[PDB]
Amino acid sequence: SGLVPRGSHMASMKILVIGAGPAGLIFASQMKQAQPGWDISIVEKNTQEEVLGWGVVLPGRPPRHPANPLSYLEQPERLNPQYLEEFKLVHHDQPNLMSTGVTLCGVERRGLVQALRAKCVAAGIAISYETPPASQAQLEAEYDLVVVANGVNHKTLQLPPSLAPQIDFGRNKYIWYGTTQLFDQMNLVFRSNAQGMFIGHAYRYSDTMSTFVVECDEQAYARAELEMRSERDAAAYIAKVFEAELGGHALVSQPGQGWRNFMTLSRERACEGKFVLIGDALQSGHFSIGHGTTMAVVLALLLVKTLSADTDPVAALDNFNARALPLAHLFRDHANSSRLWFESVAERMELSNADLTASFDARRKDLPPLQDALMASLGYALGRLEHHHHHH
Numbered sequence: 001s002g003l004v005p006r007g008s009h010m011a012s013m014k015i016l017v018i019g020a021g022p023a024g025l026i027f028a029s030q031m032k033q034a035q036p037g038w039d040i041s042i043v044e045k046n047t048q049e050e051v052l053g054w055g056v057v058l059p060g061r062p063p064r065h066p067a068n069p070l071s072y073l074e075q076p077e078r079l080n081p082q083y084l085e086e087f088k089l090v091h092h093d094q095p096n097l098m099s100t101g102v103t104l105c106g107v108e109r110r111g112l113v114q115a116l117r118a119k120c121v122a123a124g125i126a127i128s129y130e131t132p133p134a135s136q137a138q139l140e141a142e143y144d145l146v147v148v149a150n151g152v153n154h155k156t157l158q159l160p161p162s163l164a165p166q167i168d169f170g171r172n173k174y175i176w177y178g179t180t181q182l183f184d185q186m187n188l189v190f191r192s193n194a195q196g197m198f199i200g201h202a203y204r205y206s207d208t209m210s211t212f213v214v215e216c217d218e219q220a221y222a223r224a225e226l227e228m229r230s231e232r233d234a235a236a237y238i239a240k241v242f243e244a245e246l247g248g249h250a251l252v253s254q255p256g257q258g259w260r261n262f263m264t265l266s267r268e269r270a271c272e273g274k275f276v277l278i279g280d281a282l283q284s285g286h287f288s289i290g291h292g293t294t295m296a297v298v299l300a301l302l303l304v305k306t307l308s309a310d311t312d313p314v315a316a317l318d319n320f321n322a323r324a325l326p327l328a329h330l331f332r333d334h335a336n337s338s339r340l341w342f343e344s345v346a347e348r349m350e351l352s353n354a355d356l357t358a359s360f361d362a363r364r365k366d367l368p369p370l371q372d373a374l375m376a377s378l379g380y381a382l383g384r385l386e387h388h389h390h391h392h
């Protein structure tokens with residue numbers, strides 16, 4: 001009974017969503033909209049109040065972009081998103097101002113997630129918090145489908161062994177800070193000092209708060225002795241490194257979230273048995289390309305569309321795997337190309353700002369464009385204008 005359900009399209013479907021983050025919540029709510037008679041419920045391992053990170057950048061003013069999760073809220077303005085049109089690359093303490101690609105929409109992660117949870121509950125999707133998911137065999141025997149949307153937390157779950165992740169740990173160490181400095185432009189700040197290489201990724205996301213992600217190379221992390229330093233001492237050191245940008249503003253990290261090597265989680269299949277993966281759980285990519293939540297939304301929408309079709313679950317999950325895996329691997333490659341550029345920027349500091357901007361702008365040049373694949377996926381997920389649904 002770990003076999004994937006078969007035969008016909010099911011009007012009677014019992015689905016568990018493991019994880020109450022953007023991927024799980026967009027999926028659960030969009031799926032319940034498409035199939036109002038299905039039994040969809042969410043379990044979340046953490047307390048309701050726990051939400052990691054500070055702000056996120058998202059594409060466009062809502063609701064222009066179907067990949068922006070704010071586009072799925074009736075009052076996104078209540079979260080006071082911040083709209084950024086300019087990018088400031090700081091190199092050798094010299095600023096270079098330029099236009100962004102799409103309006104960047106910075107918003108608090110906590111309020112985004114809480115609004116999508118409340119939407120899910122209002123539509124009749126139950127969420128159970130502090131719920132360690134049951135064993136595989138329990139879930140297989142209790143559910144028709146298990147949608148695994150639990151982020152990079154792979155060791156917390158026992159899935160079929162075909163779904164075993166490939167883990168790669170980044171060379172830089174990073175920490176996700178919040179600060180009361182206000183960055184009205186998206187800031188990418190390169191600062192080498194006697195300990196090593198430090199990069200700051202900063203943007204305002206509320207009236208009062210900015211995200212300030214800091215990564216450093218292994219030389220900087222060892223020389224600055226950041227592992228032995230306390231949370232406060234490390235934050236004091238980093239605030240001194242970035243005093244030109246922060247002024248006298250401080251840096252805070254979230255509970256239990258400290259310095260990390262970025263975990264690029266990859267899979268070789270999106271689905272097995274009753275289990276199908278979306279969002280970071282299917283594929284994670286370095287945050288330096290700004291696509292994580294966008295991928296969470298687009299993968300969720302893709303799975304909803306395949307499960308909405310008049311086909312059996314096995315054919316639907318196969319359809320998802322064959323559409324989602326190529327997108328996820330393209331995302332991974334773009335994110336890796338960016339991640340690798342940041343791991344080696346210490347070997348590029350002699351360049352001018354204009355030339356470092358050009359190197360940064362070219363770091364994904366050899367890959368097919370990620371946006372082309374995203375748009376193609378949304379074209380499918382959103383449906384097309386045709387009297388009768390048919391294959392293209």
Ligand SMILES: Cc1cc2nc3c(=O)[nH]c(=O)nc-3n(C[C@H](O)[C@H](O)[C@H](O)COP(=O)(O)OP(=O)(O)OC[C@H]3O[C@@H](n4cnc5c(N)ncnc54)[C@H](O)[C@@H]3O)c2cc1C
Nearest residue numbers: 019021022023044045056057150151153279280287292293
């Ligand atoms: C430093 C940093 C900066 C980033 N900046 C941005 C940005 O600007 N823009 C952007 O779009 N993205 C950004 N991202 C990426 C973004 O945070 C993720 O890509 C996105 O949240 C993935 O959503 P998700 O739903 O797949 O997973 P998550 O948001 O990780 O949600 C997973 C949920 O499942 C829960 N869970 C885990 N295990 C279990 C279990 N066993 N049972 C039940 N529940 C479980 C977790 O507690 C959590 O609530 C950044 C990431 C980092 C690290």
Ligand SMILES: CCCC[C@H](CC)CO
Nearest residue numbers: 057201213287288289290
């Ligand atoms: C597309 C802009 C992405 C900004 C992101 C902030 C974490 C990385 O620099």
